[PDB]
Design a protein around this nucleic acid. Structure first.
Ligand SMILES: [Zn+2]
Ligand SMILES: [Zn+2]
Length: 57
DNA sequence: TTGGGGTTGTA
DNA sequence: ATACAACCCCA
């Protein structure tokens, strides 16, 4: 693309409105996930995903 | 159920 | 401005 917007994702067409949303989005462009369930070991990209997941246990 | 879009808050 | 968050909602 020829979008020079500083909030455009370098890896896909996504363009953020907020700097912190771009930061969050960039975490989908990696295999390393920062959060884990201490019961079953599953790995999640967002902290809120572990909270939602806890209903499993 | 999960991944990632939204809008949003605090320090 | 950045470092952590939050809940909602669709797919
Ligand atoms: Zn992207
Ligand atoms: Zn678990």
């Amino acid at each position: 693309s020829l979008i020079m917007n500083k909030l455009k994702c370098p890896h896909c067409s996504y363009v953020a409105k907020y700097r912190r949303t771009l930061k969050r989005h960039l975490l989908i462009h990696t295999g390393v996930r920062s959060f884990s369930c201490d019961i079953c070991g599953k790995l999640f990209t967002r902290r809120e995903h572990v909270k939602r997941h806890s209903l499993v246990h």
